[PDB]
Design a protein around this motif. Structure first.
Motif, PDB file in Angstrom:
ATOM      1  N   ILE B  30      47.553  41.500   1.162  1.00  9.84           N
ATOM      2  CA  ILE B  30      47.503  40.277   1.954  1.00  9.84           C
ATOM      3  C   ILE B  30      48.394  40.398   3.203  1.00  9.84           C
ATOM      4  O   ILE B  30      49.541  40.838   3.113  1.00  9.84           O
ATOM      5  N   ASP B  31      47.874  40.025   4.367  1.00  9.89           N
ATOM      6  CA  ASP B  31      48.730  39.889   5.527  1.00  9.89           C
ATOM      7  C   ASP B  31      48.341  38.595   6.224  1.00  9.89           C
ATOM      8  O   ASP B  31      47.197  38.088   6.051  1.00  9.89           O
ATOM      9  N   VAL B  32      49.311  38.046   6.944  1.00 10.66           N
ATOM     10  CA  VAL B  32      49.142  36.843   7.764  1.00 10.66           C
ATOM     11  C   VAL B  32      49.401  37.234   9.217  1.00 10.66           C
ATOM     12  O   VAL B  32      50.444  37.854   9.507  1.00 10.66           O
ATOM     13  N   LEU B  33      48.470  36.873  10.102  1.00  9.44           N
ATOM     14  CA  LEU B  33      48.564  37.239  11.532  1.00  9.44           C
ATOM     15  C   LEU B  33      48.660  35.993  12.382  1.00  9.44           C
ATOM     16  O   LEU B  33      48.172  34.923  12.001  1.00  9.44           O
ATOM     17  N   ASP B  34      49.300  36.109  13.534  1.00  7.99           N
ATOM     18  CA  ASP B  34      49.156  35.038  14.516  1.00  7.99           C
ATOM     19  C   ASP B  34      47.955  35.337  15.418  1.00  7.99           C
ATOM     20  O   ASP B  34      47.276  36.365  15.238  1.00  7.99           O
ATOM     21  N   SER B  61      51.802  44.914  15.405  1.00  7.60           N
ATOM     22  CA  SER B  61      50.453  44.402  15.602  1.00  7.60           C
ATOM     23  C   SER B  61      49.509  45.100  14.620  1.00  7.60           C
ATOM     24  O   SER B  61      49.658  46.304  14.301  1.00  7.60           O
ATOM     25  N   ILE B  62      48.502  44.366  14.186  1.00  5.58           N
ATOM     26  CA  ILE B  62      47.608  44.930  13.157  1.00  5.58           C
ATOM     27  C   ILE B  62      46.835  46.181  13.615  1.00  5.58           C
ATOM     28  O   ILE B  62      46.507  47.069  12.774  1.00  5.58           O
ATOM     29  N   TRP B  63      46.549  46.293  14.916  1.00  2.00           N
ATOM     30  CA  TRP B  63      45.822  47.487  15.392  1.00  2.00           C
ATOM     31  C   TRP B  63      46.674  48.751  15.252  1.00  2.00           C
ATOM     32  O   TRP B  63      46.136  49.847  15.385  1.00  2.00           O
ATOM     33  N   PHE B  65      47.936  49.689  12.538  1.00  2.00           N
ATOM     34  CA  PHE B  65      47.675  50.132  11.166  1.00  2.00           C
ATOM     35  C   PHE B  65      46.192  50.393  10.873  1.00  2.00           C
ATOM     36  O   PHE B  65      45.908  51.100   9.962  1.00  2.00           O
ATOM     37  N   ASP B  66      45.284  49.720  11.591  1.00  2.00           N
ATOM     38  CA  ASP B  66      43.850  49.870  11.363  1.00  2.00           C
ATOM     39  C   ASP B  66      43.262  50.801  12.409  1.00  2.00           C
ATOM     40  O   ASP B  66      43.234  50.468  13.605  1.00  2.00           O
ATOM     41  N   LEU B  67      42.917  52.005  11.974  1.00  2.00           N
ATOM     42  CA  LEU B  67      42.307  53.035  12.831  1.00  2.00           C
ATOM     43  C   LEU B  67      40.942  52.704  13.411  1.00  2.00           C
ATOM     44  O   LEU B  67      40.464  53.431  14.310  1.00  2.00           O
ATOM     45  N   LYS B  88      33.822  38.841   6.634  1.00  2.00           N
ATOM     46  CA  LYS B  88      34.131  40.122   6.000  1.00  2.00           C
ATOM     47  C   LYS B  88      33.704  41.285   6.915  1.00  2.00           C
ATOM     48  O   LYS B  88      32.622  41.274   7.515  1.00  2.00           O
ATOM     49  N   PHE B  89      34.556  42.293   7.026  1.00  2.00           N
ATOM     50  CA  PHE B  89      34.261  43.446   7.860  1.00  2.00           C
ATOM     51  C   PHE B  89      35.084  44.627   7.390  1.00  2.00           C
ATOM     52  O   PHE B  89      36.099  44.461   6.710  1.00  2.00           O
ATOM     53  N   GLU B  90      34.686  45.811   7.830  1.00  2.00           N
ATOM     54  CA  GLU B  90      35.331  47.030   7.395  1.00  2.00           C
ATOM     55  C   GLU B  90      36.482  47.408   8.319  1.00  2.00           C
ATOM     56  O   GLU B  90      36.400  47.239   9.540  1.00  2.00           O
ATOM     57  N   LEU B  92      40.017  50.504   8.414  1.00  5.03           N
ATOM     58  CA  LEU B  92      40.474  51.794   7.896  1.00  5.03           C
ATOM     59  C   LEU B  92      41.980  51.922   8.117  1.00  5.03           C
ATOM     60  O   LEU B  92      42.430  52.270   9.223  1.00  5.03           O
ATOM     61  N   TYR B  93      42.765  51.598   7.091  1.00  2.49           N
ATOM     62  CA  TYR B  93      44.213  51.642   7.228  1.00  2.49           C
ATOM     63  C   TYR B  93      44.732  53.075   7.208  1.00  2.49           C
ATOM     64  O   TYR B  93      44.199  53.913   6.502  1.00  2.49           O
ATOM     65  N   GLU B  94      45.757  53.304   8.006  1.00  3.48           N
ATOM     66  CA  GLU B  94      46.495  54.561   8.005  1.00  3.48           C
ATOM     67  C   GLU B  94      47.802  54.333   7.273  1.00  3.48           C
ATOM     68  O   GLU B  94      48.628  53.482   7.679  1.00  3.48           O
ATOM     69  N   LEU B 119      44.641  34.682   7.729  1.00  7.86           N
ATOM     70  CA  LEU B 119      44.995  35.211   6.414  1.00  7.86           C
ATOM     71  C   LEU B 119      43.946  36.258   6.101  1.00  7.86           C
ATOM     72  O   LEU B 119      42.735  35.964   6.102  1.00  7.86           O
ATOM     73  N   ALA B 120      44.409  37.478   5.827  1.00  2.00           N
ATOM     74  CA  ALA B 120      43.542  38.636   5.594  1.00  2.00           C
ATOM     75  C   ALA B 120      43.780  39.199   4.209  1.00  2.00           C
ATOM     76  O   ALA B 120      44.885  39.526   3.851  1.00  2.00           O
ATOM     77  N   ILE B 121      42.721  39.246   3.425  1.00  2.15           N
ATOM     78  CA  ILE B 121      42.759  39.884   2.116  1.00  2.15           C
ATOM     79  C   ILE B 121      41.961  41.203   2.233  1.00  2.15           C
ATOM     80  O   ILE B 121      40.739  41.204   2.469  1.00  2.15           O
TER      81      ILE B 121
HETATM   82  O1  I3A Z   1      44.449  41.350   9.034  1.00  2.00           O
HETATM   83  C1  I3A Z   1      44.134  42.496   8.732  1.00  2.00           C
HETATM   84  C2  I3A Z   1      43.170  43.264   9.594  1.00  2.00           C
HETATM   85  C3  I3A Z   1      42.870  44.620   9.296  1.00  2.00           C
HETATM   86  N1  I3A Z   1      42.001  44.960  10.305  1.00  2.00           N
HETATM   87  C4  I3A Z   1      41.790  43.932  11.176  1.00  2.00           C
HETATM   88  C5  I3A Z   1      41.005  43.863  12.339  1.00  2.00           C
HETATM   89  C6  I3A Z   1      40.957  42.678  13.100  1.00  2.00           C
HETATM   90  C7  I3A Z   1      41.684  41.554  12.675  1.00  2.00           C
HETATM   91  C8  I3A Z   1      42.480  41.619  11.501  1.00  2.00           C
HETATM   92  C9  I3A Z   1      42.538  42.829  10.777  1.00  2.00           C
END
Ligand code: I3A
Ligand code: I3A
Ligand code: MG
Ligand code: MG
Lengths: 123, 125
Positions: B30-34, B61-63, B65-67, B88-90, B92-94, B119-121
């Motif tokens: 779980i992460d919470v973003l602004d 920033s979330i980008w 971590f997400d490749l 819902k979308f795909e 790819l975490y590093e 809120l991202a699960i």
């Molecule tokens: O919040 C987690 C997350 C992982 N990839 C993305 C991509 C765009 C918005 C949020 C997120």
């Protein structure tokens, strides 16, 4: 002043954690070792069309068409503490319609008690 | 009664502690973003799965971590959400060690204690 401070900050913390749980985009339930539903988020209730009073205290096999009581017993019994597994379920909504889900299930210890935490996601 | 008051406080404390444990123990990350994509809160599962301490993640920033998303991809994704909208979308975490984790992110825009938050699960796929 120390008393009221402690109370106010405890409310603020609790409120935020409550919103994170109730509003999660995924369905969340907690079971005991008997398969009894100990907790459910509002997302679980809303997706299935139930009031939480129709879900809490009931058994999870009453909701998943793919598992009977024995099936649930067998599933839960095999878990080690902190083990996670993913599997398909098929929830029956209050109106009789169904929802195919993937459940991600965890055995863990909650407030000293043996519990299972399930996150269900629509397939 | 002071004794009655203490019991009420204890009940409130136990509830908060229970909700805390549900958050931290979630089998999914779980992460919470602004609205800018800055990571405001993360659960222990997020940190553990990616191999980072919380201090190495909060405020980033979330980008980072997400490749599968650069800063522009994240900005565009978040700006398209209406309040209470889920998608819902795909991604790819590093991980810290450079390994990667394919995930399906279930993302929600919502009002969190007065603030515009996401809120991202994330589920390992
Ligand atoms: O919040 C987690 C997350 C992982 N990839 C993305 C991509 C765009 C918005 C949020 C997120
Ligand atoms: O805990 C939610 C759940 C949904 N179907 C099953 C099946 C067996 C154990 C738990 C569950
Ligand atoms: Mg409840
Ligand atoms: Mg792009």
């Amino acid at each position: 002043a120390e008393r009221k401070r402690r109370e106010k900050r405890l409310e603020e913390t609790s409120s935020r954690l409550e919103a994170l749980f109730e509003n999660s985009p995924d369905m969340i339930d907690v079971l005991d070792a008997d398969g009894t539903i100990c907790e459910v988020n509002q997302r679980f209730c809303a997706e299935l069309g139930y009031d939480e009073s129709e879900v809490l205290g009931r058994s999870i096999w009453e909701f998943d068409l793919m598992f009977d009581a024995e099936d649930v017993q067998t599933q839960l019994s095999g878990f080690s503490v902190d083990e996670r597994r993913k599997f398909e379920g098929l929830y029956e909504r209050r109106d009789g319609s169904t929802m195919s889900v993937e459940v991600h299930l965890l055995r863990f210890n909650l407030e000293g008690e043996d519990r299972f935490l399930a996150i269900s996601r629509d397939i």
